[PDB]
Amino acid sequence: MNPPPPETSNPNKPKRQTNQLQYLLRVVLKTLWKHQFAWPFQQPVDAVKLNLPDYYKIIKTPMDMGTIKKRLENNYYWNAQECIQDFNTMFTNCYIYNKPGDDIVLMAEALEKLFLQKINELPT
Numbered sequence: 306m307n308p309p310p311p312e313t314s315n316p317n318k319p320k321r322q323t324n325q326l327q328y329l330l331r332v333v334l335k336t337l338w339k340h341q342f343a344w345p346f347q348q349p350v351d352a353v354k355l356n357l358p359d360y361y362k363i364i365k366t367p368m369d370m371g372t373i374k375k376r377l378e379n380n381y382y383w384n385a386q387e388c389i390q391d392f393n394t395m396f397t398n399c400y401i402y403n404k405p406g407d408d409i410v411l412m413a414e415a416l417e418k419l420f421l422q423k424i425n426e427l428p429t
């Protein structure tokens with residue numbers, strides 16, 4: 306019941322390694338990765354393990370930090386804005402599928418606060 310995960314490698318994609326993208330991996334993602342609440346978001350939602358066959362009926366553009374990490378490590382992105390959009394997709398998916406006050410939403414909200422603080426200032 307799980308869809309194939311989002312692509313992390315694509316040679317036809319134009320790739321770039323900007324200072325901002327290096328920082329998004331070295332600083333932003335690796336800070337969030339060690340957060341006490343990161344673990345649900347370190348890999349795609351496994352709807353089979355969670356017994357949530359409804360998850361991928363609702364969420365049609367899944368995203369997670371494990372995919373984001375592999376993309377950054379594959380220099381998959383052209384600019385930091387594309388990577389930030391992936392983070393935002395991951396958070397928005399969680400708020401769409403769940404309801405305010407749910408434990409998973411509190412974890413996402415905490416990660417997002419940290420995320421917004423870390424990207425408030427990026428390199429030039």
Ligand SMILES: Cc1ccc([C@H](C)Nc2ccc3c(c2)N(C2CC2)[C@H](C)C(=O)N3C)cc1
Nearest residue numbers: 345346350355357360398399402403408409
């Ligand atoms: C507080 C708590 C409760 C359950 C789990 C289970 C083990 N793993 C898990 C990983 C990712 C997600 C979810 C569960 N949930 C909901 C099920 C709670 C939905 C699908 C969601 O949107 N995401 C991003 C972890 C943390």
